[PDB]
Amino acid sequence: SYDEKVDHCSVIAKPMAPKKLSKKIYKLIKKSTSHKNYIRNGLKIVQKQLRLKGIVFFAGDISPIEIMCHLPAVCEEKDIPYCYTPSRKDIGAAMGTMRGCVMVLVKEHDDYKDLFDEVRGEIKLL
Amino acid sequence: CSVIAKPMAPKKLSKKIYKLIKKSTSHKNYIRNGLKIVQKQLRLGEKGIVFFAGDISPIEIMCHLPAVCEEKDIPYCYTPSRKDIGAAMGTMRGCVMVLVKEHDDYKDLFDEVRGEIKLLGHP
Amino acid sequence: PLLLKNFDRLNVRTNHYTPLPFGHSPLKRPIAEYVKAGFINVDKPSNPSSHEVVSWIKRILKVEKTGHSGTLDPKVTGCLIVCIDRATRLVKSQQNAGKEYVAVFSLHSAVENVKKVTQGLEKLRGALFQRPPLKRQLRVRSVYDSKLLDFDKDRNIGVFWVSCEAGSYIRTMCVHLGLMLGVGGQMIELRRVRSGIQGEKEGMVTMHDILDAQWAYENHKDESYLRRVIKPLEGLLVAHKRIFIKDSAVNAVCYGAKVLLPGILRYEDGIEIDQEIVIVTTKGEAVALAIALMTTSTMASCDHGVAAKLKRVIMERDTYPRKWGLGPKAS
Amino acid sequence: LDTAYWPLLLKNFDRLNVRTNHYTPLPFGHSPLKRPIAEYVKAGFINVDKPSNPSSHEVVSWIKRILKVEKTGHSGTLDPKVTGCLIVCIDRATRLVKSQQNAGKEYVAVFSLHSAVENVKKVTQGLEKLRGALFQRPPLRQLRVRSVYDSKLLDFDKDRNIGVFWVSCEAGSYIRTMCVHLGLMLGVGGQMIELRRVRSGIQGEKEGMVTMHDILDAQWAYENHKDESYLRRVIKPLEGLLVAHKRIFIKDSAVNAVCYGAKVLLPGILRYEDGIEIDQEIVIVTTKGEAVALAIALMTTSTMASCDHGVAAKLKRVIMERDTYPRKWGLGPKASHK
Amino acid sequence: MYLRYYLNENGDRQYTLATIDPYGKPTISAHPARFSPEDKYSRHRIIIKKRFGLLLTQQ
Amino acid sequence: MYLRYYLNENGDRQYTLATIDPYGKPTISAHPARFSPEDKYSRHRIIIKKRFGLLLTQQPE
Amino acid sequence: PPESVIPLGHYGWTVQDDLICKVDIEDVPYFNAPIFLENKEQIGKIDEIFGNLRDYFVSVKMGDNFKANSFKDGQQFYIDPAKLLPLKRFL
Amino acid sequence: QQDQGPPESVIPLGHYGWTVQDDLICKVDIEDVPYFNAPIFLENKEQIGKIDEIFGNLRDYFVSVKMGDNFKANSFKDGQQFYIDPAKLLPLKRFL
RNA sequence: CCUGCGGCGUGCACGUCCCAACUGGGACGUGCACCGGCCGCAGGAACAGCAACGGAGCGAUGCACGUCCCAACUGGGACGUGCACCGCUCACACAU
């Protein structure tokens, strides 16, 4: 269930995307995967790209939280929206892989310009 | 309304008070609007009825004016709200208090209002 | 009681002491002295300044002296502490009591969202620079905490609660916040909510209440209103580390004598070298504000010596009879 | 009196035996938990949790460059890939590093057997038969004997053929060798995948564990915000490392003499802890609670109660800096001439 | 004026800029009534707030 | 990594290799987070942990 | 007047007609300190110091024949070498 | 670290226990701790390999031997006794 | 006699790239850590004194009421009442 998966998650796992937002987020990741330069997967690459835009989705089932507990404040400073999802397994699956992912950055393209924009709004009001 | 908003007029008495205010606006000499103005008029000892607004906070700003009214025997009552008084004045600005004086043009109306006020009583 | 609460929790050096017929508890002082050793937690109106309200309190009360422990700008309401007469000896001790405000602010331009304002408030934490609003000597004061208690976008107006170090210019902090949210902002309203260890819920009465208490006292000899209005100066020192001193040592302290271990009935755990403490009697009266030269372990491990010197004597002389020099030696 | 809750070396202050209560306390020195930031930092330690990849030496150097301290060292050494407890002393508890090198150590080891076994009881009994004074060689040379006081099989999985066991052992014992010996004993061989020190001496999992990020964040808070509570949470006074020793409280005039090499002569003793035996390591401390030094009791506790002159203890390591108290020795009645 | 307040369950001053609190009741201004040293109406306030049970001595 | 743990009623760590608790909770990683000396996100870490109350200073003792 | 100059900081952001800057150099500049340019040309003066006591922001009220847009992010602002205070002074 | 001097007389070193891979494990009943890489021999002074690991309690312990191609570990049965060169046997005092 | 101080090419982190997890590799430049006794210096030679002779208390433009001009719990104007902005002394104290 999406309720207990969210419940498992960390205290820092807010703002938490609701069920419909999570379906939309998975769809966005799956679409973006089709373009090589439009998803940054992993802690190292996401951190590098953020230091060097889009939406950064974090996984709320990470521990110890110190591995990326600072990156939410980094996103706040850089004005990049962010939201937590109940599991890294789901993000990894949406990325077309079994291995889970702690976080994923989704850029923006014309092909799904609408798609991205919708979720952005839904996460700005969250 | 503030706990101190007594004596309190019912709905019908509130409408009749609004009517008395509206008619008394004809002779602004008989009306006295504002808190400082009603204060000084009461101090000088002007006879009439006083209509307060229970929607006043902090109540210290006017909590004394009911006591002086009782002292000088100038009957008074509270309306449901200050915005109602402002609408009665038609100035689109709330007035916490009003003092109504007696003119022949509305002698019977202000006579009914005062009789009902006396009927209302004081705790 | 006050200043005697949890007195059993204090380390006991000796229960053998000499009670004396002198002295009264701070909260049962006869009316004349009660006012002389009290202070008011008043709600400052917006027109008068801190000096003016202090002077008005003096004039109403008909008392020798009056002072305050923090300057509220003329247009800033909030809690003002006003020591009366003898209690003014504690004004200096409160010069650095941490304060707490609820400031209403306005931004000259709209923000993207409430989260922007919340983040800008969050980043104004810790020790930040501050300049007196229009001397030009910059100071540094620390904001312990901050919060955006409310924001409204149509008016551009917000309400934020701040806890800051004593002497912090809130208006300066609001200019800093506006300048920190990218749009510019000024403090359109301020209200001190908690000065030191005093706030709203701690018996904070209004100026009309002071005038009414004075009127009641004069016209019906009813001091109850004045008692609810003026609280003992011992309430300003409930957070201070207490050293209870026997009856026969109180007067020596009054005359400037240092506190010595052979007359410490109790010493509160947690005392440290160079610690501001309250030398109190057995009945709760603040004999003095002292500096402890021995830690609590040192007091427990010693039978004589200098425990705590005096920094500011509060109790008057001759309050207790001269009872020094009749010790065990009698030499 | 209620001294049970007092901090560090003042614990059970009232239970100690009292030689005397007469002296003139001096205002020099502060309680260890309330020193200025500099003295607190210079006289403390950090139960740091070692990151997996770097070495213990690297961790000590990092803590040095973070706290900007001249000297620092670790009681026990951990391998580059081994996490767990790591007590890093700060510039004045370094003098207790030698006394902390013999401290016990509880590890948690994950091991993998070369091939399957009969059942879990096989590994349980194999571990039960490796509890004692075991021979061990340095990894990659002299043989050594190290004691493994206890061991327990926390978990075992058969599909992957991997187990987790917790071992209490004395310093210098390489748990890698213990895993190898367990493998050789079961009857198949084995090795160690990971190691995690859960206790380094008297510092356990819940006893003030901090991480490197915690140290860095406390340093940042003190440097930019000028906030000290975080650095006081990270660093703790060295008296913590000495909470197990039997204490010898001395008069304030005797403190500087001891800091100058003078043995702990009986006249400068206020209170002493019961149970002191000859040649037993003890801690010379002030009434404030600052550990003056570590000495070796040359007298029992009964002789201390029944003696007037002599040498109560012999210095081994002076921790307190010289001149931190005045030279109030030599002004006593029996000090005009030696 | 701009700053108003209401009370939560514990009575703590919840400071807001809204004229109607979340619970639906009207808000109360956080400021005291303007004071003037030349104010003869102490008797008036005392009697009113003794009548309505709002005086401090009653609390 | 291989080694993980879960907290029992008394707060003591109980180690195990499983990725789920005896009750159901996920198992935390025993290995503390990797550290780098050149970490430039102290301010951000404190911001987040103070926002969520995870910073050391907010706990008792 | 300025014989030489030193780097006070780099551009931060703008707030109305202002140049809020990030000041990397620890030293606190002097209120109304003329913030010069590389080539010894003043561009404004200080109005309010805000931020923490080790890495803060300087507010400049651009005054003369220049604007808050003429500077773009990534540009350093300069200061007279003898117009500063040690950071222990206000501590 | 001598690597010559073919073995001299030998004395009982223990009795055969179990086996682990090519390595052969034997339970030692003598008290002396043998050298490392100390060749082990049968009653005929024919070297079979060398010491690899020494593990076990201080007094009663076990010894692992790695063999030259001249023997397989399964070639020895239960009760088969091993022998050691007396010179390479150090006393317990060296490690006590 | 006691004490203090000092001497006797592997991995780690980050940075830039290639590929094929909170991951595991390489290449290119970076810093970081490792691979008891003797010698010399320094201080002091320590049986741990000091239950009072410098402490304390004193002096050195705005706002409110009232009257008028007009134009909310108000913001303006005129003119009045007011309110705020080194010396002395006391014992010289270990607390029955």
mmCIF file with all atom_site columns, all heavy atoms in Angstrom, chain D residues 26-37:
data_model
loop_
_atom_site.group_PDB
_atom_site.id
_atom_site.type_symbol
_atom_site.label_atom_id
_atom_site.label_alt_id
_atom_site.label_comp_id
_atom_site.label_asym_id
_atom_site.label_entity_id
_atom_site.label_seq_id
_atom_site.pdbx_PDB_ins_code
_atom_site.Cartn_x
_atom_site.Cartn_y
_atom_site.Cartn_z
_atom_site.occupancy
_atom_site.B_iso_or_equiv
_atom_site.pdbx_formal_charge
_atom_site.auth_seq_id
_atom_site.auth_comp_id
_atom_site.auth_asym_id
_atom_site.auth_atom_id
_atom_site.pdbx_PDB_model_num
ATOM 1  N N   . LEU D 1 26 ? 41.108 27.679 46.266 1.00 0.00 ? 26 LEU D N   1
ATOM 2  C CA  . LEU D 1 26 ? 41.491 28.758 45.377 1.00 0.00 ? 26 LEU D CA  1
ATOM 3  C C   . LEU D 1 26 ? 40.558 28.808 44.172 1.00 0.00 ? 26 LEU D C   1
ATOM 4  O O   . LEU D 1 26 ? 40.023 27.778 43.751 1.00 0.00 ? 26 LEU D O   1
ATOM 5  C CB  . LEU D 1 26 ? 42.932 28.581 44.892 1.00 0.00 ? 26 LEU D CB  1
ATOM 6  C CG  . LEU D 1 26 ? 43.935 28.028 45.905 1.00 0.00 ? 26 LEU D CG  1
ATOM 7  C CD1 . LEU D 1 26 ? 45.329 28.033 45.305 1.00 0.00 ? 26 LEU D CD1 1
ATOM 8  C CD2 . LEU D 1 26 ? 43.909 28.820 47.199 1.00 0.00 ? 26 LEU D CD2 1
ATOM 9  N N   . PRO D 1 27 ? 40.339 29.985 43.586 1.00 0.00 ? 27 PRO D N   1
ATOM 10 C CA  . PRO D 1 27 ? 39.432 30.096 42.439 1.00 0.00 ? 27 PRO D CA  1
ATOM 11 C C   . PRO D 1 27 ? 40.018 29.626 41.116 1.00 0.00 ? 27 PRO D C   1
ATOM 12 O O   . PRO D 1 27 ? 39.374 29.813 40.080 1.00 0.00 ? 27 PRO D O   1
ATOM 13 C CB  . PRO D 1 27 ? 39.135 31.603 42.395 1.00 0.00 ? 27 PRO D CB  1
ATOM 14 C CG  . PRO D 1 27 ? 40.362 32.237 42.938 1.00 0.00 ? 27 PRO D CG  1
ATOM 15 C CD  . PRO D 1 27 ? 40.904 31.291 43.974 1.00 0.00 ? 27 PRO D CD  1
ATOM 16 N N   . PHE D 1 28 ? 41.205 29.029 41.119 1.00 0.00 ? 28 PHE D N   1
ATOM 17 C CA  . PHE D 1 28 ? 41.856 28.631 39.879 1.00 0.00 ? 28 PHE D CA  1
ATOM 18 C C   . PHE D 1 28 ? 41.252 27.339 39.348 1.00 0.00 ? 28 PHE D C   1
ATOM 19 O O   . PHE D 1 28 ? 40.998 26.397 40.103 1.00 0.00 ? 28 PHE D O   1
ATOM 20 C CB  . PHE D 1 28 ? 43.358 28.455 40.102 1.00 0.00 ? 28 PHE D CB  1
ATOM 21 C CG  . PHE D 1 28 ? 44.046 29.695 40.589 1.00 0.00 ? 28 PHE D CG  1
ATOM 22 C CD1 . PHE D 1 28 ? 43.979 30.062 41.920 1.00 0.00 ? 28 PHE D CD1 1
ATOM 23 C CD2 . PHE D 1 28 ? 44.759 30.496 39.715 1.00 0.00 ? 28 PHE D CD2 1
ATOM 24 C CE1 . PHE D 1 28 ? 44.609 31.203 42.372 1.00 0.00 ? 28 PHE D CE1 1
ATOM 25 C CE2 . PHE D 1 28 ? 45.393 31.639 40.159 1.00 0.00 ? 28 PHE D CE2 1
ATOM 26 C CZ  . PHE D 1 28 ? 45.317 31.992 41.490 1.00 0.00 ? 28 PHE D CZ  1
ATOM 27 N N   . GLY D 1 29 ? 41.026 27.300 38.040 1.00 0.00 ? 29 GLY D N   1
ATOM 28 C CA  . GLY D 1 29 ? 40.430 26.148 37.400 1.00 0.00 ? 29 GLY D CA  1
ATOM 29 C C   . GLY D 1 29 ? 38.912 26.182 37.447 1.00 0.00 ? 29 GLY D C   1
ATOM 30 O O   . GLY D 1 29 ? 38.297 26.833 38.290 1.00 0.00 ? 29 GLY D O   1
ATOM 31 N N   . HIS D 1 30 ? 38.304 25.459 36.512 1.00 0.00 ? 30 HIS D N   1
ATOM 32 C CA  . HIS D 1 30 ? 36.857 25.386 36.396 1.00 0.00 ? 30 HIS D CA  1
ATOM 33 C C   . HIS D 1 30 ? 36.429 23.929 36.353 1.00 0.00 ? 30 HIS D C   1
ATOM 34 O O   . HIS D 1 30 ? 37.225 23.038 36.054 1.00 0.00 ? 30 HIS D O   1
ATOM 35 C CB  . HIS D 1 30 ? 36.351 26.102 35.139 1.00 0.00 ? 30 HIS D CB  1
ATOM 36 C CG  . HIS D 1 30 ? 36.695 27.554 35.093 1.00 0.00 ? 30 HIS D CG  1
ATOM 37 N ND1 . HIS D 1 30 ? 36.133 28.481 35.944 1.00 0.00 ? 30 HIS D ND1 1
ATOM 38 C CD2 . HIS D 1 30 ? 37.545 28.242 34.296 1.00 0.00 ? 30 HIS D CD2 1
ATOM 39 C CE1 . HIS D 1 30 ? 36.622 29.678 35.673 1.00 0.00 ? 30 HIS D CE1 1
ATOM 40 N NE2 . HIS D 1 30 ? 37.480 29.561 34.678 1.00 0.00 ? 30 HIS D NE2 1
ATOM 41 N N   . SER D 1 31 ? 35.159 23.695 36.660 1.00 0.00 ? 31 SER D N   1
ATOM 42 C CA  . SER D 1 31 ? 34.618 22.356 36.507 1.00 0.00 ? 31 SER D CA  1
ATOM 43 C C   . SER D 1 31 ? 34.759 21.930 35.048 1.00 0.00 ? 31 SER D C   1
ATOM 44 O O   . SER D 1 31 ? 34.613 22.760 34.144 1.00 0.00 ? 31 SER D O   1
ATOM 45 C CB  . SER D 1 31 ? 33.152 22.309 36.936 1.00 0.00 ? 31 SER D CB  1
ATOM 46 O OG  . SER D 1 31 ? 33.035 22.091 38.328 1.00 0.00 ? 31 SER D OG  1
ATOM 47 N N   . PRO D 1 32 ? 35.058 20.657 34.777 1.00 0.00 ? 32 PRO D N   1
ATOM 48 C CA  . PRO D 1 32 ? 35.374 20.274 33.391 1.00 0.00 ? 32 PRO D CA  1
ATOM 49 C C   . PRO D 1 32 ? 34.247 20.534 32.408 1.00 0.00 ? 32 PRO D C   1
ATOM 50 O O   . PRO D 1 32 ? 34.517 20.867 31.249 1.00 0.00 ? 32 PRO D O   1
ATOM 51 C CB  . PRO D 1 32 ? 35.691 18.777 33.504 1.00 0.00 ? 32 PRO D CB  1
ATOM 52 C CG  . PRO D 1 32 ? 35.917 18.519 34.949 1.00 0.00 ? 32 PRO D CG  1
ATOM 53 C CD  . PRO D 1 32 ? 35.075 19.497 35.681 1.00 0.00 ? 32 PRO D CD  1
ATOM 54 N N   . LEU D 1 33 ? 32.991 20.388 32.829 1.00 0.00 ? 33 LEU D N   1
ATOM 55 C CA  . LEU D 1 33 ? 31.863 20.571 31.925 1.00 0.00 ? 33 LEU D CA  1
ATOM 56 C C   . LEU D 1 33 ? 31.544 22.035 31.660 1.00 0.00 ? 33 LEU D C   1
ATOM 57 O O   . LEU D 1 33 ? 30.717 22.321 30.789 1.00 0.00 ? 33 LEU D O   1
ATOM 58 C CB  . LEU D 1 33 ? 30.620 19.882 32.490 1.00 0.00 ? 33 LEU D CB  1
ATOM 59 C CG  . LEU D 1 33 ? 30.580 18.363 32.329 1.00 0.00 ? 33 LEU D CG  1
ATOM 60 C CD1 . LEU D 1 33 ? 29.566 17.754 33.269 1.00 0.00 ? 33 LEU D CD1 1
ATOM 61 C CD2 . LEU D 1 33 ? 30.275 17.982 30.893 1.00 0.00 ? 33 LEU D CD2 1
ATOM 62 N N   . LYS D 1 34 ? 32.174 22.964 32.383 1.00 0.00 ? 34 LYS D N   1
ATOM 63 C CA  . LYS D 1 34 ? 31.869 24.385 32.273 1.00 0.00 ? 34 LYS D CA  1
ATOM 64 C C   . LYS D 1 34 ? 33.109 25.219 31.970 1.00 0.00 ? 34 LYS D C   1
ATOM 65 O O   . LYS D 1 34 ? 33.129 26.417 32.258 1.00 0.00 ? 34 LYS D O   1
ATOM 66 C CB  . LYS D 1 34 ? 31.204 24.889 33.557 1.00 0.00 ? 34 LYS D CB  1
ATOM 67 C CG  . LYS D 1 34 ? 30.239 23.904 34.234 1.00 0.00 ? 34 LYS D CG  1
ATOM 68 C CD  . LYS D 1 34 ? 28.798 24.018 33.748 1.00 0.00 ? 34 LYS D CD  1
ATOM 69 C CE  . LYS D 1 34 ? 28.239 25.433 33.827 1.00 0.00 ? 34 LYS D CE  1
ATOM 70 N NZ  . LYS D 1 34 ? 28.521 26.080 35.138 1.00 0.00 ? 34 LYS D NZ  1
ATOM 71 N N   . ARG D 1 35 ? 34.144 24.617 31.398 1.00 0.00 ? 35 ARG D N   1
ATOM 72 C CA  . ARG D 1 35 ? 35.324 25.377 31.046 1.00 0.00 ? 35 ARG D CA  1
ATOM 73 C C   . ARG D 1 35 ? 35.003 26.313 29.891 1.00 0.00 ? 35 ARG D C   1
ATOM 74 O O   . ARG D 1 35 ? 34.021 26.114 29.175 1.00 0.00 ? 35 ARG D O   1
ATOM 75 C CB  . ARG D 1 35 ? 36.478 24.465 30.634 1.00 0.00 ? 35 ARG D CB  1
ATOM 76 C CG  . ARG D 1 35 ? 36.543 23.118 31.315 1.00 0.00 ? 35 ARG D CG  1
ATOM 77 C CD  . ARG D 1 35 ? 37.982 22.709 31.550 1.00 0.00 ? 35 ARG D CD  1
ATOM 78 N NE  . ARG D 1 35 ? 38.113 21.281 31.809 1.00 0.00 ? 35 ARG D NE  1
ATOM 79 C CZ  . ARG D 1 35 ? 39.178 20.712 32.356 1.00 0.00 ? 35 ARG D CZ  1
ATOM 80 N NH1 . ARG D 1 35 ? 40.229 21.424 32.725 1.00 0.00 ? 35 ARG D NH1 1
ATOM 81 N NH2 . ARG D 1 35 ? 39.187 19.396 32.540 1.00 0.00 ? 35 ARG D NH2 1
ATOM 82 N N   . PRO D 1 36 ? 35.811 27.347 29.689 1.00 0.00 ? 36 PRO D N   1
ATOM 83 C CA  . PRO D 1 36 ? 35.716 28.099 28.433 1.00 0.00 ? 36 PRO D CA  1
ATOM 84 C C   . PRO D 1 36 ? 35.830 27.159 27.245 1.00 0.00 ? 36 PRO D C   1
ATOM 85 O O   . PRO D 1 36 ? 36.204 25.997 27.417 1.00 0.00 ? 36 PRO D O   1
ATOM 86 C CB  . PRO D 1 36 ? 36.895 29.075 28.511 1.00 0.00 ? 36 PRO D CB  1
ATOM 87 C CG  . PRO D 1 36 ? 37.155 29.243 29.965 1.00 0.00 ? 36 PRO D CG  1
ATOM 88 C CD  . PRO D 1 36 ? 36.767 27.952 30.631 1.00 0.00 ? 36 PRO D CD  1
ATOM 89 N N   . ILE D 1 37 ? 35.509 27.632 26.042 1.00 0.00 ? 37 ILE D N   1
ATOM 90 C CA  . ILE D 1 37 ? 35.549 26.749 24.879 1.00 0.00 ? 37 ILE D CA  1
ATOM 91 C C   . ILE D 1 37 ? 36.952 26.180 24.692 1.00 0.00 ? 37 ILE D C   1
ATOM 92 O O   . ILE D 1 37 ? 37.121 24.993 24.385 1.00 0.00 ? 37 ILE D O   1
ATOM 93 C CB  . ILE D 1 37 ? 35.061 27.495 23.623 1.00 0.00 ? 37 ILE D CB  1
ATOM 94 C CG1 . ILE D 1 37 ? 34.829 26.512 22.471 1.00 0.00 ? 37 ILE D CG1 1
ATOM 95 C CG2 . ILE D 1 37 ? 36.057 28.570 23.211 1.00 0.00 ? 37 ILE D CG2 1
ATOM 96 C CD1 . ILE D 1 37 ? 33.608 25.633 22.651 1.00 0.00 ? 37 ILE D CD1 1
#
